[model samples]
Target: QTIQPGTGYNNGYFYSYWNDGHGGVTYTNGPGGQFSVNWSNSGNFVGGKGWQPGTKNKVINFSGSYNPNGNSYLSVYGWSRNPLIEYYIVENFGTYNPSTGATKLGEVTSDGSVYDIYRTQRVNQPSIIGTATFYQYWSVRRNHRSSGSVNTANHFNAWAQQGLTLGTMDYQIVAVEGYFSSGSASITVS
Candidate 1:
């Protein structure tokens, strides 16, 4: 139980990531989708656990203590190939709201909660592949929360309904992201 502070790129559970922008974080991956993390002084980063080649439509279940501080968020974040898309199913957030400058397309309800969907384009930006152009589809929850289950199909279906569709499934993770602040998160998913 002495895993050092660093990015878990296929090091722990499936996959984990961190930017270490003037901040740091450490995480430990356990069996059965069990994982924990601690961070402080973070900035523009995301870290958690999930599969590499993620599933398109799966009922993802998670529950845990998501103690966060400053500007942060708990979301199911991932990307897709071909069409080159990055997506987020944001459950909770802190400090600044993510919908400040984002384009609000519509909304959807799932897991007994409501969410505002948005689509943002990233022109010439970094991605799972390389510096490329892509689109970021978002589902920001109206009621911020820490943990719960997110049926990927629900959001994906809603996206398609709104003319937003995904390509090939990539690495999907239920991660905690902190921006220009500090925080920590621990989660278990099934």
Candidate 2:
């Protein structure tokens, strides 16, 4: 199948591929040309992935609750640099499962780590050729444990933003990647 990337705005988007735990790879391009296949999907093809050093300077993990099974959504919001305004693309599903009445299952948001991006591939096709630059400003946060059937609060957001300039990991204007699932649906931010 072939499709064109979204041409709405510029900032960053998320795309996740899946594998059956055994060995398989899937590619899903977002509105932007950015995409990310599950590292484990390509049968350990990350050894040839291209990962030099990105311009990401700072980061923070965001976690919070929205409501009990409350139409939870994940949106790719953009911020105006000059006036400093935030824009919402729309509340989306990172990876949702409606039957559970759960909102976000949680995610990680940090630079490449020992196990996170150790062998991640840029592309999942050939070993000679390095993986493409499908994702920019990529990160993964720790998974959020389910709160179970308790209706107290079930949603959360783990965000890390580039503050002041870059070298700051504070909790100001935190921005979590597009990693959230409303039980039946999911959203990926890389």
Candidate 3:
């Protein structure tokens, strides 16, 4: 199989065509790609598959698996470009300080799984979709104990209720992000 790098916009989503840091990525049948990172320290990531431009009342179903390791995580990445909003439903977490300057916004249940929500403000980041610069509100989940399949619409509702506002959906991706620092890590999604 051929492994390539960079990004692409297709089917209303942006695909991360390359692997950053110390590993490489291969195109796979499931979830568009299979991610494997070996002996890395930072900037390890794979996949950028899924749709975009935040629309309310939409359902996004996802299933995947995360290899056991430290310094990495398997999560769903969702973003909004206009208002610079980002959210993550972390299915599994590896040993890493995944967030910086994040403040706990409490817990919410989505499709039977309880998630501790947290948020942070980020600026001067490239838009996850098209070419643009932005400031972002990053939200993520913790204490996530799901079997990889998630109903993200429910999570949106929960966040809305918490006074979090989202703008035009820029993109949504299912990915494995690693800060491996040592061992290897991977995730499969479909």
List candidate 1 segments past 4 Å from native: 1-13
Screening candidate 1 with a backbone cut-off below 3 angstroms (N, C-alpha, C), the clashing residue pairs are: none
Model 3: residues >4 Å from true position, as ranges? 9-14, 21-42, 97-101, 129-146, 182-190
Q: Lowest-lDDT window of 10 residues in candidate 2?
A: 146-155
Q: Over the stretch 74-122, how does candidate 1's per-residue lDDT look in tens digits?
A: 8898889998999999988888777789988888999878999999899
Q: Order of all candidates by TM-score, from best down to worst?
A: 1, 3, 2
lDDT of 2 by residue, 41-137 (tens): 1231110011122122312222232221323333222222222222221222234422233223233332321101111112343211243232112
Number of residue pairs clashing in candidate 2, backbone atoms closer than 3 angstroms, sequence gap of 3 or more or interchain: 34
**Once model 3 is optimally superposed onto the true structure by TM-score, how far is the C-alpha of residue 140 displaced, in angstroms?**
5.1
Assess every candidate by TM-score. Answer: 0.89, 0.21, 0.71
Reference-based lDDT, each prediction: 0.80, 0.23, 0.56
Per-residue error for 25 in candidate 2, Å, reads: 0.9
lDDT, candidate 3, 3-113, per-residue tens:
456556543455554455455334432234434434334445555465544355555455434454556656677677557676777766667545555776667776556
